[PDB]
Design a protein around this nucleic acid. Structure first.
Ligand SMILES: *[C@@H]1O[C@H](CO)[C@@H](O[C@@H]2O[C@H](CO)[C@@H](O)[C@H](O)[C@H]2NC(C)=O)[C@H](O)[C@H]1NC(C)=O
Ligand code: NAG
Ligand code: NAG
Ligand code: NAG
Ligand code: NAG
Ligand code: NAG
Ligand code: NAG
Ligand code: NAG
Ligand code: NAG
Ligand code: MG
Length: 750
DNA sequence: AGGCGTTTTT
DNA sequence: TCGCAC
């Protein structure tokens, strides 16, 4: 039986997904479809320019409707083609159950009539230039109204959006209003007092006063950022804040006693008026980024009262054309007892010392400090030792060079107690002195430095808690026998992209240190171009995962018997990545020398044109085999062998023309199979013996299926349809004639 | 005439 | 195969 909502796909929770189908009108679906059960209909990025009274009339329990990007205004069209969307008067009134509507990125100039059931309305990036009391008649349950981007450089209109005084007072339930990028010069008058979120960023509102926020005493978030910009930082078209602006009255915010979040970013602020924060006792988030507060933060008392503040953004408060020799934060930061997160990135200052951050040093809840992109060249990392709550320091993208004068394969540090990011700095050697006071660290990132050192066991000595060390993108010379042995808790080591030493033809390297790392569980040697003159064996009783992708095992395994047991000493290994190793051949004997403990083997993007499937019996614990991106021309040469525990097989992006009968029949644990992007002209149940009904995933997209009338694959795919992703749209014909490139459902082949 | 295309946010 | 110790 056919998928029920062709050409669309039924997804969980009553979602009918019609996205990206190039539809010119709303599909009606068959009278046999359960139109009753449809709660959400997605029509994202089709090319529907005309909506009709009958379009949604049969979807009698429809709650969510997404029509975004159907008819973009010329400024937002990728080719600047104009578009105007017509909407018959009852299009949405015919859906009395509708709760959420997205009409954004559509060329409409008025708000259509809407049912009184509506709770959320998105009208962003349309050409609606006015809201008056008749625009939103009857929407007494509306809680969210987003209408951003109706008049700006990507969607110009030649005037300000006009929201008439009191236009929205009839929306007595309205809690969220967003009117960003609308060329406003004043705040709309007499907005609904129920508002909790008012977002007015990236307009040209350059004066504020208490009268502009009259009666908005329920506000929890107010965003007025980006209304008076510093164009020297801008990535986009930008007009400079005029001289002597902005003008924000002392008492602008003083009635907003419930305010939790205030955004004053990119407002050309050189000074902070302490009165702005008076009476904001519930304020937890303050964004002051992209202002000119570099001197103010050394002297201000404006933070004195902010006892509930959790997150403070001061990023990109830099002085044009300069960096500072020194920076000393004001004493008043010490009263921020709730502070959890401070962002000081992009201020530009050259020395980080005891005095810089002293007011923060006893703040008990301070967990995350962002100090990246500051051109810091001298950093006393010892300053952090006695910070009582610190979990994360970002010092990446600086100029520090020393002491002062798949998570399967590599875990992240997100769950760890103390992480320092020193990636993208200027280290060329690692000296232990710089880490002397950092013995509490669990994770250290040193990726993308210039480390060129023959590490030997003396570099990381103080780091006795360190579990994860990221040295990727450096030039470490792997040679000495005791590298990394000074890290007694090391579990994960990333040495990927340290290729330059391995490219020194004629100079060998030594990986014997891996055997000396008794706690190591995850290692990456990926993208190192390892190809000759290296240790003949890697050895570890502890290692679980090894990423060896992006090397030349092809060259190693061609050199007689030298490297045929290279991985065999990894006695507990469960996951191995041998992707992108230029492999044109394997021997069964070579596969049999991989660790018998292996559960996952990746061989992606090699050049294998043959695979001896019987050799899988040599890997009796194997559950996942990834052969995507090779050059197989068939699934033949014996079938999957009896007894295999294989659960997942990926042979996508090969050149597979046919599969032998019964190829998969003996893989009784097989659940996921990817045949995508091969040269298969059919899909046959006989491939599977009598076990095709057991598959949970069968991907057959991007194959040149032969769509002859009565083609047998059609019935088969309908029988297993629950397992086939994208069946309604991405399973396409390669032939005959005009069917080439069309869905197998474009015409009824039965 | 319409088409284009996977498009966050500045 | 990188200051070892003919
Ligand atoms: C089957 O394989 C195809 C092709 O190898 C997968 O499609 C790719 O998926 C990744 C994301 O997982 C994308 O980054 C690629 O750019 C996609 N490429 C193509 C050509 O589609 C597909 O997702 C796999 N199927 C399943 C069910 O995992
Ligand atoms: C913004 O409004 C002014 C008129 O006040 C107009 O000059 C300008 O073109 C408008 N900007 C855009 C992007 O339409
Ligand atoms: C707000 O909506 C609720 C429930 O959707 C409704 O009962 C109430 O009458 C509405 N209130 C106002 C002030 O319109
Ligand atoms: C604020 O509310 C008061 C009392 O309800 C009313 O008199 C006043 O007009 C409102 N202010 C504005 C600017 O709408
Ligand atoms: C926070 O807002 C509440 C209402 O939630 C109000 O009673 C109080 O004045 C505000 N300040 C604090 C510190 O609770
Ligand atoms: C590491 O090399 C240095 C010379 O830079 C040497 O002094 C030190 O003893 C070596 N450490 C080990 C563990 O061999
Ligand atoms: C690798 O280094 C270890 C420890 O120093 C040493 O025993 C072994 O001989 C070295 N390998 C080569 C090929 O010299
Ligand atoms: C492998 O199968 C291919 C494709 O059917 C066939 O040409 C080839 O002779 C087979 N080789 C072996 C060794 O089985
Ligand atoms: C697979 O390898 C085994 C053992 O080397 C060999 O006996 C058999 O002939 C091979 N199969 C194919 C299809 O070449
Ligand atoms: Mg060499």
């Amino acid at each position: 039986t056919l998928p029920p909502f062709l050409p669309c796909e039924l997804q969980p929770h009553g979602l009918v997904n019609c996205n990206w189908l190039f539809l010119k009108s709303v599909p009606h679906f068959s009278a046999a479809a359960p139109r009753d059960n449809v709660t959400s209909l997605s029509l994202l990025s089709n090319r529907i320019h005309h909506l009709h009274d009958s379009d949604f009339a049969q979807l009698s329990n429809l709650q969510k409707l997404n029509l975004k990007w159907n008819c973009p205004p010329a400024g937002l069209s990728p080719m600047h083609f104009p578009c105007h969307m017509t909407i018959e008067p009852n299009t949405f009134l015919a859906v009395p159950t509708l709760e959420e509507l997205n009409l954004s990125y559509n060329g409409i100039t008025t708000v259509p009539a809407l049912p009184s059931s509506l709770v959320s309305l998105i009208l962003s990036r349309t050409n609606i230039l006015q809201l008056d009391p008749t625009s939103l008649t009857g929407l007494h349950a509306l809680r969210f109204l987003y209408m951003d981007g109706n008049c700006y450089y990507k969607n110009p209109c030649g005037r300000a959006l006009e929201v008439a005084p009191g236009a929205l007072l009839g929306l007595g339930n309205l809690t969220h209003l967003s009117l960003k990028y609308n060329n406003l010069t004043t705040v709309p008058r007499s907005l609904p007092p129920s508002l909790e979120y008012l977002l007015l960023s990236y307009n040209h509102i350059v004066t504020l006063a208490p009268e502009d926020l009259a009666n908005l005493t329920a506000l929890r978030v107010l965003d007025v950022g980006g209304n008076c910009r510093r164009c020297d930082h801008a990535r986009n078209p930008c007009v400079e804040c005029p001289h002597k602006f902005p003008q924000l009255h002392s008492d602008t915010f003083s009635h907003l006693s419930r305010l939790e979040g205030l955004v004053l970013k990119d407002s050309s602020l050189y000074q902070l008026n302490p009165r702005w924060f008076r009476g904001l006792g519930n304020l937890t988030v303050l964004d002051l980024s992209e202002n000119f507060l570099y001197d103010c933060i050394t002297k201000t008392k404006a933070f004195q009262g902010l006892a509930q503040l959790r997150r403070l953004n001061l990023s990109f408060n830099y002085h044009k054309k300069v960096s500072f020799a020194h920076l000393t934060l004001a004493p008043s930061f010490g009263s921020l007892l709730s502070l959890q997160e401070l962002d000081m990135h992009g201020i530009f200052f050259r020395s980080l010392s005891q005095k810089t951050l002293q007011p923060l040093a006893r703040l008990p809840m301070l967990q995350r400090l962002y100090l990246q992109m500051n051109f810091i060249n001298q950093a006393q990392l010892g300053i952090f030792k006695d910070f009582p709550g610190l979990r994360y320091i970002d010092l990446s993208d600086n100029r520090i060079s020393g002491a002062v004068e798949s998570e399967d394969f590599m875990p992240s540090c997100k769950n760890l107690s103390f992480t320092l990011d020193l990636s993208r700095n200027n280290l060329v050697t690692v000296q232990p002195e710089m880490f002397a006071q950092l013995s509490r660290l669990q994770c250290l990132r040193l990726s993308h430095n210039s480390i060129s050192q023959a590490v030997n066991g003396s570099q990381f000595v103080p780091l006795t808690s360190l579990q994860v060390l990221d040295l990727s993108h450096n030039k470490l010379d792997l040679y000495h026998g005791r590298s990394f042995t000074e890290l007694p808790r090391l579990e994960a080591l990333d040495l990927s992209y340290n290729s330059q030493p391995f490219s020194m033809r004629g100079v060998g390297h030594n990986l014997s240190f891996v055997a000396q790392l008794p706690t190591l569980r995850y290692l990456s040697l990926a993208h190192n171009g390892i190809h000759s003159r290296v240790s003949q064996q890697l050895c570890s009783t502890s290692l679980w995962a090894l990423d060896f992708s992006g090397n030349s095992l092809s060259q190693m395994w061609a050199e007689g018997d030298l490297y045929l047991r290279f991985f065999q000493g990894l006695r507990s290994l469960i996951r191995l990545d041998l992707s992108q190793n230029r492999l044109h051949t394997l021997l069964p004997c070579t596969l049999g020398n991989l660790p018998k403990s292996l559960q996952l083997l990746r061989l992606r993007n090699n050049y294998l044109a043959f695979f001896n499937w019987s050799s899988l019996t040599l890997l009796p614990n194997l559950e996942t085999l990834d052969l995507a991106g090779n050059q197989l021309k068939a699934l033949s040469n014996g079938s999957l062998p009896s007894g295999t525990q294989l659960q997942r097989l990926d042979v996508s992006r090969n050149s597979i023309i046919f599969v032998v009968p019964g190829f998969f029949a003996l893989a009784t644990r097989l659940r996921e199979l990817n045949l995508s992007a091969n040269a298969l002209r059919t899909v046959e149940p006989s491939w599977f013996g009598f076990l095709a009904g057991s598959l949970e995933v069968l991907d057959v997209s991007a194959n040149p299926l032969h769509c002859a009338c009565g083609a047998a694959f059609v019935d088969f795919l309908l029988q297993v349809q629950a397992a086939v992703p994208g069946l309604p749209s991405r399973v396409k014909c390669g032939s005959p004639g005009q069917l080439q490139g069309r869905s197998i459902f474009a015409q009824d082949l039965r």
